Design a protein around this ligand. Structure first.
Ligand code: NA
Lengths: 142, 26
């Protein structure tokens, strides 16, 4: 369907987060990636709508107001650790929503390079075993 | 880096379980 499913998911996540940052997209999506975007966008907007206090609480724990390189690295490692602890597709969707809030809170606009790599790094980890994530969001309605 | 792993984990678990419930009702 695509050449590499993990790459598709990684591209979709970076694109989505940038879209929620109101950042000009640097790269557009393929036909297949755009299909996955539409599915993920609906799920993540619904999580944001239902669990905003829960995500805001996490952001308080993560001290998202601190955009220093040291604290951004700390946020990355804590999110990666939580994902390794609970690797399910639904968790990955929740984490995408969490990143969206982090970006909306700390005012990320593309120039904080450590934050850009946080987005890249977590997109990479979410994209591992993408087959399971794709099956979850396809069948979520299919 | 793990000081909040349990607290964050518990929050992710509740959101994930609910998403699974919606999926199960598809
Ligand atoms: Na620095």
């Amino acid at each position: 369907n695509s050449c590499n499913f993990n790459n598709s998911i990684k591209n979709v996540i970076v694109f989505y987060i940038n879209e929620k940052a109101l950042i000009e997209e640097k790269k557009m999506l393929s036909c297949y990636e755009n299909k996955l975007l539409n599915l993920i966008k609906e799920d993540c907007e619904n999580i944001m709508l239902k669990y905003k206090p829960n995500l805001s609480y996490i952001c308080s724990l993560l001290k998202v107001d601190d955009t220093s390189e040291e604290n951004i690295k700390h946020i990355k490692d804590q999110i990666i650790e939580s994902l390794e602890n609970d690797n399910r597709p639904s968790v990955k969707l929740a984490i995408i929503s969490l990143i969206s809030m982090i970006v909306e809170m700390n005012g990320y606009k593309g120039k904080n390079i450590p934050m850009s790599f946080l987005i890249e790094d977590i997109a990479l980890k979410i994209s591992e075993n993408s087959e399971d994530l794709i099956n979850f969001i396809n069948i979520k309605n299919k | 880096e793990e000081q909040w792993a349990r607290e964050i984990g518990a929050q992710l678990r509740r959101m994930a379980d609910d998403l699974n419930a919606q999926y199960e009702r598809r």
